[PDB]
Design a binder for this molecule. Structure first.
Ligand SMILES: CN1CC2=C(C(=O)N1)[C@@H](c1ccc(C#N)cc1)NC(=O)N2c1cccc(C(F)(F)F)c1
Ligand SMILES: *[C@@H]1O[C@H](CO[C@@H]2O[C@@H](C)[C@@H](O)[C@@H](O)[C@@H]2O)[C@@H](O)[C@H](O)[C@H]1NC(C)=O
Ligand SMILES: *[C@@H]1O[C@H](CO[C@@H]2O[C@@H](C)[C@@H](O)[C@@H](O)[C@@H]2O)[C@@H](O)[C@H](O)[C@H]1NC(C)=O
Ligand SMILES: CC(=O)N[C@@H]1[C@@H](O)[C@H](O)[C@@H](CO)O[C@H]1O
Length: 215
């Protein structure tokens, strides 16, 4: 996250770090005790048996007893199309269930087909590049936009300054009115261009599919 701020520790206890050999590569959202959701581009070309799913983290540079670590049991995809930048969503079934506590919660999702209007106020977040790469979870105020956005995305823009999501933020949730409406998918013009909006996978478009998998 470029131009964001440090989150309060454990403020977004649904927030997940996907790791390989101890290092963060992507975000995710805990959507049930035994399922996370992320971006499909996060796990394209990745050894998913190597993937560690880290719950309850805040400061990645630190040893944290609040953490719960899982492996990936199964993956579920929904027609990922990298060429057309479509269906950038994956569900990763964990090898065990999370212990739901202060530090580890299941996110709330929107109703199916719920569209967000121009001007909706959201919170983007993640452990991606800062413009270094972040130790402490970052968050950022973003506004939903329809210009320079396709109907197959929710797009956001910070107005009046250059800020937005960046590399390592891939797969991270976009929280809008307390619901996960986005999964960070792609940027244009580099990170934080002040020109192109950030594009997210539109979670509301995939709710019936998500529900079917998690119950
Ligand atoms: C490097 N990584 C990130 C990446 C692409 C990629 O293929 N891998 C690649 C990409 C290609 C297809 C689809 C689809 N559908 C989504 C992303 N293009 C791209 O813009 N990013 C990227 C860079 C910075 C931030 C973000 C994010 F946080 F917004 F998600 C994504
Ligand atoms: C589920 O897996 C947890 C983490 O396993 C570790 O990470 C994966 C990606 C591999 O590298 C693996 O060799 C590591 O052991 C375990 O800590 C946890 O006990 C597992 N839960 C089960 C089996 O119920
Ligand atoms: C910055 O965002 C703050 C927190 O955002 C609110 O809560 C999160 C969980 C999301 O639901 C988001 O939709 C909400 O707006 C706000 O309290 C604050 O008003 C925002 N400030 C500006 C000017 O955008
Ligand atoms: C999570 C959070 O900070 N939500 C806030 C809310 O508490 C406050 O009433 C409002 C102020 O405009 O902005 C939103």
């Amino acid at each position: 996250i470029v131009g964001g701020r440090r989150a309060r520790p454990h403020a977004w206890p649904f927030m997940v770090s996907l790791q390989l050999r101890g290092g963060h590569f992507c975000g995710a959202t805990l959507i049930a005790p035994n399922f996370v959701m992320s971006a499909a581009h996060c796990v394209a070309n990745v050894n998913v048996r190597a993937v560690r799913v880290v719950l309850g983290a805040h400061n990645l540079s630190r040893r944290e007893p609040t953490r719960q670590v899982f492996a990936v049991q199964r993956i579920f995809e929904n027609g990922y199309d990298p060429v057309n930048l479509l269906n950038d969503i994956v569900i990763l079934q964990l090898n065990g269930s999370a212990t739901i506590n202060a530090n580890v919660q299941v996110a709330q999702l929107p109703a199916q087909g719920r569209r967000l209007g121009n001007g909706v106020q959201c919170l983007a977040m993640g452990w991606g590049l800062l413009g270094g790469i972040a130790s402490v979870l970052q968050e950022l105020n973003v506004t939903v936009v329809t210009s320079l956005c396709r109907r197959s995305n929710v797009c956001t823009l910070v107005r009046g300054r250059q800020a937005g999501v960046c590399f390592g933020d891939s797969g991270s949730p976009l929280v809008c009115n307390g619901l996960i409406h986005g999964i960070a998918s792609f940027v244009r013009g580099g990170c934080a261009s002040g020109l192109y909006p950030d594009a997210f996978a539109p979670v509301a478009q995939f709710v019936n599919w998500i529900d079917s998998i998690i119950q």
